[PDB]
């Protein structure tokens, strides 16, 4: 399930 900002920031 998507975590906003997790691509750039974990």
């Amino acid at each position, epitope marked *: 399930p*998507i*975590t*906003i*900002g*997790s*691509h*750039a*920031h974990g």
Partner: antibody
Amino acid sequence: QVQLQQPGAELVRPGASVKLSCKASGYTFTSYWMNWVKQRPGQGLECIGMIHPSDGETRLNQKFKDKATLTLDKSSSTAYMQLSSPTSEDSAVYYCTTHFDYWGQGTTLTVSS
Amino acid sequence: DIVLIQSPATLSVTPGDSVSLSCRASQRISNNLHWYQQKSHESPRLLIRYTSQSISGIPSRFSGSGSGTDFTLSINSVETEDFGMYFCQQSNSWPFTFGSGTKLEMKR
């Protein structure tokens, strides 16, 4: 580096389908959701939907259920969003972004005969 | 769909002023609220995620607060590079929705 590469502009005749591309590089393509966002210039932002390249699981905004189709070409790390039967209401900028942190530059789609 | 209401529509400031931007949700969304900045001819930029967690490198003048249905973006002392549009977005329920935006412009 992470890149999401979108063409700057596409032109489409009304009623003719168009497929917009978002070419991903510099990360594991199957590790993150790919989202599509619509913006009519000077206006707000709308979530079109998202697809996970792991297995192609797709979530659409019901508003676009008869308009937008999300697909992939995983071998070339590309996400596609196809618009069916475009009308002047479909002329907008379309962005791809993964987790709303990395964003493409957006494609300006213009519908005209 | 969850509705996000932003206010004011426009904020007119002099560099150095402090501002507060409001986002209110139509139902409880917990801490699942993000703020974006969008400058003319640019894609949006994630400023603050999950209410208050500032993005690496975003200047420290920016902060987010609130919970439940009531959220605030604060900018401590506005710089000219801060002028543009600010949107809130909820990721509590699909479809994720954005507010209508607050424009921060230069006062004269």
